[PDB]
Design a protein around this ligand. Structure first.
Ligand SMILES: Nc1nc2c(ncn2[C@H]2C[C@H](O)[C@@H](COP(=O)(O)OP(=O)(O)OP(=O)(O)O)O2)c(=O)[nH]1
Ligand SMILES: [Mg+2]
Ligand SMILES: [Zn+2]
Ligand SMILES: [Zn+2]
Ligand SMILES: [Zn+2]
Lengths: 65, 114, 263, 182, 163, 196, 49, 134, 773
RNA sequence: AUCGAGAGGA
């Protein structure tokens, strides 16, 4: 169910970062600790926004009609 | 459903004034002003400035309840000083300091790169 | 100049980090609060859904649109809708925008803030554009469509103070610290054996001098010098977020003064 | 797990060896060979014990630390010892004594008992994605949380509990403090 | 047992004394043993104390025994309250328990004891024996939807023609 | 509710400004009371939160599986490498005034849950509504604008207070209250009252 | 959903007198959850496995 | 009106931080007077006080209405002193014969003074200040 | 029982409750939704016709407004529909059902309602949001919490009901509870824990902060108090500004332990008119204690004055704390390196002590105690041996906790938490029991199938050696779980067995009420008590006060009460009495002092005869000690100038007062005798504190001030008498009933099981026993 | 709307 636009507790836009997040983990083969850090996500409030994020949309599309 | 719409924190309702003025009965030469649709952002800044002035005897603000935006500022001045003037002086001081800040900052910003 | 004193340390397009000398804690604080939640911006405040066949629900998306950051450089020349003499909204008080997205491919069609298009007349002012800091050139995931999924929306942005909704906050997070060494003794440090070995020394210790065990407590000293860092979402550049901060405080201090005149 | 003294080399050891674990994970990684729960059971390495037969056997809690051979970190808890000779069986893992609900409490062992009971009631009343086809079914009442989050503290059990993929709870930033008294 | 007793000098000092504690009770025959003080012997069974030492001894025992369960548990109630309970349990001559067998029998109005446990059984025998209901009890006026003799209703109010 | 039997509702909701804040510039999404802690000895709650901070920073998962060699000691070690002070504490500032809070605060991620029963599902009020047929009383359930039971246990309280008239008013002017006709000789409700 | 499909119900009892069925017994070790049980009404009579 | 009420010079014998961080209870002996002792609570953060120091204690009762801040330097003020407190007097105990002791509370910080020749001096009064110097 | 003893009723409401510190004690936060829904029939009078028309014009959708207007005919006018809803002209005599607005009296309970304090009047404040908001200090007579409790509300529909709500069931009027002759509401949690923090000697608050606090108290006279420190930086002390909330003429004394008017450890309390003099303020002071501040301010100043006290103490302390803050980490359960090593060695030394008694018992060299099994002697030993170990461990852990430790600080304040909590969290959780005995053999001859058979050792029988900070072991965890479930069982069983005690109590005392001759009858007119409480007085008024005729040396009693005029060494110094010199000698007077002392002797023997234990502190109408302190500070009396009383004004005065104390008012032999007996005890107290020697030597009363003290004692007495009408029936049932329901758990039966025997009057009782002397 | 049953809430 989608990334948060903007992390609840800080305010910072986090929506635009998901696409890049999965690239930095799978293609570049980096650990999640640096994948949060490369995306400029320095404080933990805005780090838990993305690491803890479960992306169910992908499974929701699986349904045909 | 019993939630009061958020605009009621800065928008003034029906026949509400931004300031109400009231003489205090308990202490001589004291006044209690009720600021509508304001809060700590403003109360604290004025009560701080109403303290640097050596002609004021008493200075305090409180938000009676957080549910409503209002706050009460009580001021007490020395004989021959009107409290309404202490607030006037106090306010101007604030604007002055701020006008400086703004100018000093713009001066510093323009001396940066990136 | 005369009173307050600023000194930028590091400055970029998204962060400003500075020292703020010769001011009262009250003011330094009020500068924080008024930055956080009182500078006006622009953000979607009414969506009219025409067709929505996605997995995400109507009000869900609407909410996601609220959050999308909008360019608010010339936001001071745009009026509040509550003030404007029109009916509902115009070009003088709102920006209206349309989104259309349909499932084209097999590969999941994505919907970005890039795909939002301005449909009202701007009249030459730098407003309403959707802010993108993405390297890929499209920012913020709106929704995902499948084979034959259609979304068709009409968003009317309006002017708003963050106090009305957290969407109109231009501020993100705002660092704030004074007196790195406990020299004013404003905090009682919690410890087990040793205070200073257990608590960590902050970036801002290299700009003040240690207290020296030999010296007695200074009681006459007050709060001065304030280390801050103000971040920005991108609807207003950093420089202005603090400027407008100072300005809006200044405005609502004055309106107190001008309502003593009218009384 | 079964423990038989089936050792020429020495002492009473666990029937299962690392070689067995390696075949078992050769079946996870390939998602040729085909090694499942049944192949453990049939080979005779694992053995279904009911409560009456539990009366005649002596079980070891941990494989490694309850039967190797004959300093201390003060921080680690105080555990008894071996003090038993004739282990017939061993435990697959102590944390498997818990149900579905209690499996989601992080550090139940560090936390007072009746409270761990409470969590197991509330869990069932916690709200999120209860099924991925929630749109399609027509149920009297369904609550679905806008933005589920796999918690930062997990139990290994949540692996099989599919909790990681279907959260019900966000991960708040939490201050414990006397603020306003509200 | 520790026991405060008056010293010759006048003040109170702590006397150590040996007291014997039982398990099982036949009081009619324990006190009449030579060697003990048959003026202070106590039992936790207030039912035996009633049989042996009269109703009124039992009343103090019954209180002692209620008091004991409250006090020992930390809690503190005021004497009058317990004393009202005990006293009601005691004033019909015997030990009248607070259950359908005890108190819900005592020639009180039919309507009242209806509000408690045996509901329709009471009504039947009241139809039989032609019981008249006084209507001075709370419960009767609750049922009748009338103002009870209770604080506000304990009395009556009239106008009087001057002054 | 956290994941530790520690349950509780929202008393008030402050905005980011009125809310206390760390030097880094974090706000809490949530502030619970310290008094809900020592009585209920839910230590794991603290532990989780210490774990949860280090996982947010480290970019790792926090292992909270019961029986393991995970210890508050080794968690703190891990944290102090990461910069914050070992025991969960963080110096915060009062959002109202700006002055640093005298006492430092325990702060950090903790998985919280939202439960059914929210206030708007609960609230109910009645002032003269639909009766039952057989009893002529108010109807159970707020689903059809019902009325709350003034049971015997609430009745016993108006008695101990000695409020008689109110004891009547609730049992006549609200709820029931009917008007019948009684014969002078025989005390029965025979009377065929031909009114008008 | 899970732990509903794994529930166990025991009713009540008989004519001799006593033994305490609500209480968690040693033998439950590994078969019936120690923690998970409803509070009040049917506490310990209902169990999850 | 306004007058001094007692004056003496004392020497510190004991210093004790009784589980506190800003307050110490202080025991001082009197010079010349072999029948006089002093016990007092002193804010060591504001005016530090070490063992074997000599301090001068006055009491006074003047130099009713709200307090007034600054502009007191534009006023005459009976203080060539460093440490200065205001208190209440509560008990007036008699340590046998002709030997009296007075008790003060400076909003919490306590005082016990012992002697004899302060019988017509320290009344049963709502006032009473306290001044320590050098 | 379902349709008559209790009916579902109208004009009622229910929502979740939440706490509100910026709200007043006797208020209640009714949400606007509800406000608009509920109503009150108000007859149109010339006084209200303007203020009422406004409302009807406002209609049913805008808050302060109304639905329905009733006419003379009785035809109802529905203001949500109707054609004439912006028209209607109100006549005198019509009724107008308006929404509830501020300061209406509503009745407010929380179920189960096993009190009179479970139902209380509140003034309505209407408020935005959905919860019923209440005062954090009115939490405990209701026993509700904000974890999710629902609360009910009822609305009276008559002027007279409004009265008999706000005069009788009003919250302030409920503060000193009759059940337990003390208050029932206090200060709690933040305000309790925060108050301790503020009162500390180190707590110094400076100018800017102090002025906001002053301004925060609404009763503040607008007069900055003088700062305890006026050196370099003028600093006020915690105790200073809190004392702004404490009214004038409030006296309090305590003495905790190490308390010598010097307070080396800031023990005890002394409050001299209004200001506080020494001691930290905590549970013992401002909690719902017996001799506390709330008990004082109530009886002294009034309910209404005391109800506003709660307000003040909170507005200030909650403010202070908002800016001081307070917290709780894991750090507060962590204890020192050497302490942890030492805690283990403590455990390790009782481990080997259990192992050695076992080894001795296995060798049959174990002497069996008189009247118990060899096996019982063993268990009994091993339990006590392991309980000592948990407590030596815990106490060891509590000595190591610093002062800045958060947990310790709530335990110190008395806000939440206690000793056990510390031991279990940091040191060890200790033994786990089920049904008395330690964890029994479930499987044959072993506890779990990880142990061997016949293993009586500590770890196999459910001694959890570990703390919650260290974590429990697999075996340990399950054993905890056993004894855990056991408490959950009774919390679900006991709780409903107790509710059945209360019904039974309630239904049998029901009609017990004192009539207009202090007689205490039932429905029939059967006497139960001839004077209520055997003393006539209402339980709210009565309080614990010592009887100094009983204790002390025969010689110490003399040196304290005896006045001998015919002995130069034992006469009353002429410094004490005006007419001192001209009394020394005499003859006619010394008859009256041999009359007085003869009575103080006949009293001392009698009290020793009644209270054979020799206990001196007993509950009793009128707090004399506090009246005497109210004289000596009111009349500003210096302890140097002689009294102007006659030895005849005291002695014959105190006997005249005695005469008009009046509980029963019959004017014939029988009742006259009961009047004597009903007061006996109170008089022993009167004569003790109002004896010629003390009145003059100890507390120096003047003729004017002494006659006042007599005047008060009489008034305060008469006020203490029980009011006919009082339904004592329910009063006592609830009074025994409720605390029962609070109980939750050496061979004897005690507690709920035990009580069940007593009331049932069980013939076949579980633990019979004599006690032979 | 009537009966019976089950799940939860304090
Ligand atoms: N101050 C004080 N509070 C107590 C005492 N005993 C119990 N309490 C409080 C702590 C508990 O919250 C409550 C009684 O037990 P509960 O079973 O209600 O505990 P819990 O903390 O889980 O609260 P909850 O069940 O959510 O209402 O009352 C006491 O002696 N003093
Ligand atoms: Mg509760
Ligand atoms: Zn964030
Ligand atoms: Zn417009
Ligand atoms: Zn008839």
């Amino acid at each position: 169910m989608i990334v948060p636009v903007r992390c609840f507790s800080c305010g910072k836009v986090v929506g635009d970062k998901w696409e890049s997040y999965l690239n930095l983990l799978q293609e570049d083969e980096l650990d999640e600790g640096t994948a949060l850090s490369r995306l400029g996500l320095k404080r933990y409030c805005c780090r838990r926004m993305i690491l803890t994020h479960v992306d169910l949309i992908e499974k929701f599309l699986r349904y045909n009609p | 459903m019993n939630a009061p719409d958020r605009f009621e924190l800065f928008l003034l309702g029906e026949g509400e004034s931004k300031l109400k003025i009231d003489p205090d009965t308990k202490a001589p030469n004291a006044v209690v002003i009720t600021f509508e649709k304001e809060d700590h952002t403003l109360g604290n800044l004025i009560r701080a400035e109403l303290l640097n002035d050596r002609k004021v005897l008493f200075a305090a603000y409180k938000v009676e309840h957080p549910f409503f935006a209002r706050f009460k500022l009580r001021i007490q001045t020395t004989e021959g000083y009107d409290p309404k003037d202490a607030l006037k002086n106090a306010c101007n001081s604030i604007i002055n300091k701020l006008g400086a800040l703004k100018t000093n900052f713009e001066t510093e910003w323009n001396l940066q790169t990136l | 100049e005369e009173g307050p004193q600023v000194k930028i340390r590091e400055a970029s397009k998204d962060n400003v980090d500075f020292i703020l000398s010769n001011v009262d804690l009250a003011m330094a604080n009020s500068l924080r609060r008024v930055m956080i939640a009182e500078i006006p911006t622009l953000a979607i405040d009414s969506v009219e859904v025409e067709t929505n066949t996605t997995v995400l629900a109507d009000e869900f998306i609407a909410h996601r649109l609220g959050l999308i950051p909008l360019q608010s450089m010339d936001i001071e020349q745009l009026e509040y809708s509550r003030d404007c003499f029109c009916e509902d909204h115009c070009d003088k008080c709102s920006v209206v925008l349309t989104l259309q997205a349909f499932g084209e491919s097999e590969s999941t069609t994505n919907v970005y803030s890039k795909d939002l298009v301005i449909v009202s007349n701007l009249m030459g002012r730098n407003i309403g554009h959707p802010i993108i800091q993405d390297k890929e050139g499209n920012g913020v995931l709106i929704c995902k469509l499948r084979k034959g999924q259609e979304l068709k929306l009409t968003c009317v942005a309006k002017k708003g103070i963050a106090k009305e909704h957290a969407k109109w906050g231009p501020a993100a997070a705002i660092e704030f610290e004074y007196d790195p060494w406990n020299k004013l003794k404003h905090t009682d440090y919690w410890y087990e054996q040793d205070s200073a070995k257990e608590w960590p020394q902050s970036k801002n210790c290299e700009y003040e001098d240690p207290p020296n065990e030999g010296d007695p407590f200074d009681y006459k000293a007050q709060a001065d010098t304030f280390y801050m860092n103000v971040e920005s979402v991108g609807s207003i550049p950093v420089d202005q977020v603090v400027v407008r901060g100072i300005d809006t405080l200044q405005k609502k201090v004055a309106s107190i003064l001008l309502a003593l005149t009218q009384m | 797990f079964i423990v038989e003294d089936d050792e020429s080399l020495g002492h009473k050891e666990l029937k299962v060896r690392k070689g067995h674990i390696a075949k078992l994970m050769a079946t996870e990684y390939q998602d040729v060979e085909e090694y499942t729960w049944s192949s453990l059971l049939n080979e005779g390495l694992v053995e279904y014990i009911d409560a009456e037969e539990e009366e005649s056997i002596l079980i070891a809690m941990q494989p490694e630390d309850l039967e190797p051979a004959e300093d201390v970190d003060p921080a680690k808890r105080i555990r008894v010892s071996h003090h038993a000779t004739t282990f017939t069986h061993c435990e697959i893992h102590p944390s498997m004594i818990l149900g579905v609900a209690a499996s989601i409490i992080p550090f139940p062992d560090h936390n007072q008992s009746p409270r761990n009971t409470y969590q197991s009631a509330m869990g069932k009343q916690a709200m999120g994605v209860f099924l991925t086809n929630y749109n399609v079914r027509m149920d009297t009442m369904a609550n679905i949380l806008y933005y589920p989050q796999k918690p930062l503290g997990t139990t290994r059990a949540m692996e099989y509990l599919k909790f990681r993929e279907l959260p019900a709870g966000q991960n708040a930033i939490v201050a414990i403090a006397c603020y306003s008294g509200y | 047992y520790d026991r405060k007793v008056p010293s010759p000098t006048g003040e109170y000092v702590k006397e150590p004394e040996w007291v014997l504690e039982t398990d099982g009770v036949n009081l009619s025959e324990v006190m009449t043993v030579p060697g003990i003080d048959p003026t202070r012997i106590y039992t936790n069974s207030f039912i035996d104390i009633m049989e042996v030492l009269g109703i009124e001894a039992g009343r103090a025992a019954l209180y002692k025994e209620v008091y004991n369960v409250i006090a020992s548990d930390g809690s503190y109630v005021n004497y009058r309250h317990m004393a009202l309970l005990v006293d009601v349990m005691t004033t019909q001559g015997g030990l009248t328990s607070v259950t359908r067998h005890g108190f819900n029998r005592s020639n009180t109005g039919a309507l009242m004891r209806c509000s408690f446990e045996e509901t329709v059984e009471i009504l039947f025998e009241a139809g039989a024996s032609a019981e008249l209901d006084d209507c001075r009890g709370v419960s009767e006026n609750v049922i009748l939807g009338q103002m009870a003799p209770i604080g506000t209703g304990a009395f009556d109010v009239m106008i009087d023609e001057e002054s | 509710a956290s994941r530790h039997g520690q349950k509780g509702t929202i008393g008030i909701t402050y905005r980011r400004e009125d809310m206390p804040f760390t030097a880094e510039g974090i706000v809490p999404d949530l502030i619970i009371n310290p008094h809900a802690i020592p009585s209920r000895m839910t230590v794991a709650h603290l532990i989780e939160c210490l774990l949860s901070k280090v996982a947010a920073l480290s970019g790792n998962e926090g292992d909270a599986s019961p029986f393991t060699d995970i210890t508050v000691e080794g968690i703190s070690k891990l944290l102090r490498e990461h910069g914050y002070q070992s025991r969960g504490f963080e110096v915060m500032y009062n959002g109202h005034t700006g002055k640093k809070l005298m006492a430092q605060i325990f702060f950090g991620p903790t998985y919280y849950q939202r439960l059914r029963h929210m206030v708007d599902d609960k609230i109910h009020a009645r002032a003269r509504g639909p009766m039952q047929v057989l009893t002529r009383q108010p109807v159970e359930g707020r689903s059809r604008d019902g009325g709350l039971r003034f049971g015997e246990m609430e009745r016993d309280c108006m008695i101990a207070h000695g409020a008689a008239s109110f004891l009547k008013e609730r049992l006549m002017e609200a709820s029931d209250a009917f008007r019948v006709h009684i014969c002078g000789i025989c005390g029965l409700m025979t009377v065929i009252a031909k009114l008008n | 959903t899970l732990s509903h499909l794994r529930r166990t119900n025991t009713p009540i009892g008989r004519d001799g007198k006593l033994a305490k069925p609500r209480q968690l017994h040693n033998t439950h070790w590994g078969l019936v959850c120690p923690a998970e049980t409803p509070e009040g009404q049917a506490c310990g009579l209902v169990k999850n496995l | 009106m306004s007058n001094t009420l007692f004056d003496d010079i004392f020497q510190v014998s004991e210093v004790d931080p009784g589980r506190y961080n800003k307050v110490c209870r202080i025991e001082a002996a009197s010079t010349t007077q072999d029948q006089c002792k002093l016990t007092l609570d002193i804010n060591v953060e504001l005016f530090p006080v070490a063992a074997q120091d000599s301090l001068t204690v006055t009491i006074a009762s003047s130099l009713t209405r709200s307090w007034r801040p600054p502009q007191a330097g534009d006023r005459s003020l009976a203080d060539d002193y460093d440490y200065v407190m205001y208190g209440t007097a509560y008990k007036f105990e008699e340590v046998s014969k002709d030997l009296i002791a007075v008790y003060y509370s400076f909003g919490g910080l306590l005082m016990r003074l012992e002697g004899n020749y302060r019988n017509l001096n320290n009344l049963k009064q709502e006032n009473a200040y306290l001044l320590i110097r050098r | 029982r379902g349709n008559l003893m209790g009916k579902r009723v109208d004009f009622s409401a229910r929502t979740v409750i939440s706490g509100d510190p910026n709200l007043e004690l006797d208020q209640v936060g009714v949400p606007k939704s509800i406000a608009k829904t509920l109503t009150y029939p108000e007859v149109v009078t010339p006084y209200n016709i303007d203020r009422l028309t406004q409302l009807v014009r406002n209609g049913p959708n805008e808050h302060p407004g109304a639905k329905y207007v009733i006419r003379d005919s009785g035809d109802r006018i529905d203001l949500r529909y109707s054609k004439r809803a912006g028209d209607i002209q109100l006549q005198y005599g019509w009724k107008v059902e308006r929404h509830i607005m501020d300061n209406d009296p509503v009745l407010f309970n929380r179920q189960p309602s096993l009190h009179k304090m479970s139902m209380m009047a509140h003034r309505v404040k209407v408020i935005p949001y959905s919860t019923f908001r209440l005062n954090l200090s009115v939490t405990s007579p209701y026993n509700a919490d904000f974890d999710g409790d629902e609360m009910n509300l009822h609305v009276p529909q008559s002027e007279e009901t409004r009265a008999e709500l706000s005069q009788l069931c009003a919250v302030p009027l409920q503060i000193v509870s009759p059940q337990s002759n003390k208050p029932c509401m206090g200060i709690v949690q933040d305000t309790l824990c925060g108050i301790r923090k503020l009162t500390l000697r180190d707590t110094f608050i400076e100018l800017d902060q102090v002025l906001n606090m002053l301004y925060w108290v609404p009763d503040w006279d607008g007069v900055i108090p003088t700062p305890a420190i006026i050196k370099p930086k003028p600093l006020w002390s915690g105790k200073q500004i809190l004392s702004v909330a404490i009214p004038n003429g409030i006296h309090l004394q305590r003495f905790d332990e190490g308390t010598t008017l010097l307070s080396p450890k800031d023990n005890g309390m002394l409050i001299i008119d209004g200001q506080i003099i020494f001691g930290v303020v905590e549970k013992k002071t401002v909690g719902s204690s017996n001799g506390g501040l709330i008990h004082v301010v109530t009886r002294e100043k009034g309910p209404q004055v005391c109800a506003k006290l709660f307000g003040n103490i909170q507005k200030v302390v909650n403010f202070w704390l908002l800016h001081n803050g307070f917290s709780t980490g894991i750090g507060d359960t962590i204890a020192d390196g050497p302490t942890m090593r030492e805690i283990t060695e403590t455990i390790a030394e009782a481990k080997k002590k259990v192992l050695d008694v076992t080894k001795e018992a296995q060798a049959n060299l174990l002497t069996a105690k008189h009247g118990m099994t060899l096996r019982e002697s063993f268990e009994d030993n091993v339990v006590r041996f392991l309980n000592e170990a948990r407590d030596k461990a815990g106490r060891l852990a509590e000595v190591n906790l610093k002062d800045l430790n958060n947990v310790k600080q709530m335990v110190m304040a008395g806000s939440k938490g206690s000793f056990i909590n510390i031991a279990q969290m940091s040191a060890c959780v200790g033994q786990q029991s089920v049904e008395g005995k330690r964890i029994a053999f479930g499987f044959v001859d072993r506890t779990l199938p990880h142990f061997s058979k016949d293993d009586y050792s500590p770890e196999s029988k459910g001694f959890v050696e570990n703390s919650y900070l260290r974590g429990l072991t697999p075996q340990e965890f399950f054993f905890h779980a056993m004894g855990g479930r056991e408490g959950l069982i009774d919390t679900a069983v006991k709780t409903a067995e107790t509710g059945y005690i209360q019904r039974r109590l309630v239904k049998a005392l029901e009609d017990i009420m004192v009539h207009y001759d202090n007689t205490t009858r039932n429905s029939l007119g059967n006497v139960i008590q001839f004077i209520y409480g055997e003393d006539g007085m209402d339980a709210a008024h009565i309080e614990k006060q010592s009887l100094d005729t009983i204790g002390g040396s025969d010689a110490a009693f003399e040196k304290r009460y005896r006045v001998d005029l015919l002995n130069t060494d034992h006469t009353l110094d002429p410094s004490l009495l005006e007419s001192g010199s001209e009394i020394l000698g005499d003859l006619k007077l010394q008859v009256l002092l041999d009359e007085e002392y003869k009575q103080l002797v006949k009293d001392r023997k009698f009290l020793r005869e009644v209270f054979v234990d020799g206990e001196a502190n007993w509950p009793l109408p009128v707090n004399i000690r506090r009246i005497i302190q109210n004289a000596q500070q009111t009349f500003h009396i210096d302890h140097t100038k002689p009294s102007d009383l006659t030895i005849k004004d005291i002695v014959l005065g105190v006997k005249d007062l005695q005469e008009n104390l009046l509980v029963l008012r019959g004017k014939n032999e029988i009742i006259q005798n009961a009047q004597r007996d009903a007061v006996t005890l109170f008089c022993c107290l009167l004569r003790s504190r109002l004896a010629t020697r003390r009145v003059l030597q100890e507390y120096r009363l003047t003729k004017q001030a002494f006659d006042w003290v007599l005047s008060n004692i009489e008034a305060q007495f008469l006020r203490s008498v029980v009011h006919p009408g009082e339904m004592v029936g329910v009063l006592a049932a609830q009074s025994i009933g409720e605390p029962a329901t609070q109980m939750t758990l050496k061979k004897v039966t005690s507690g709920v099981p035990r009580l069940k025997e007593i009331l049932n009057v069980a013939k076949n009782m579980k633990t019979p026993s004599l006690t032979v002397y």
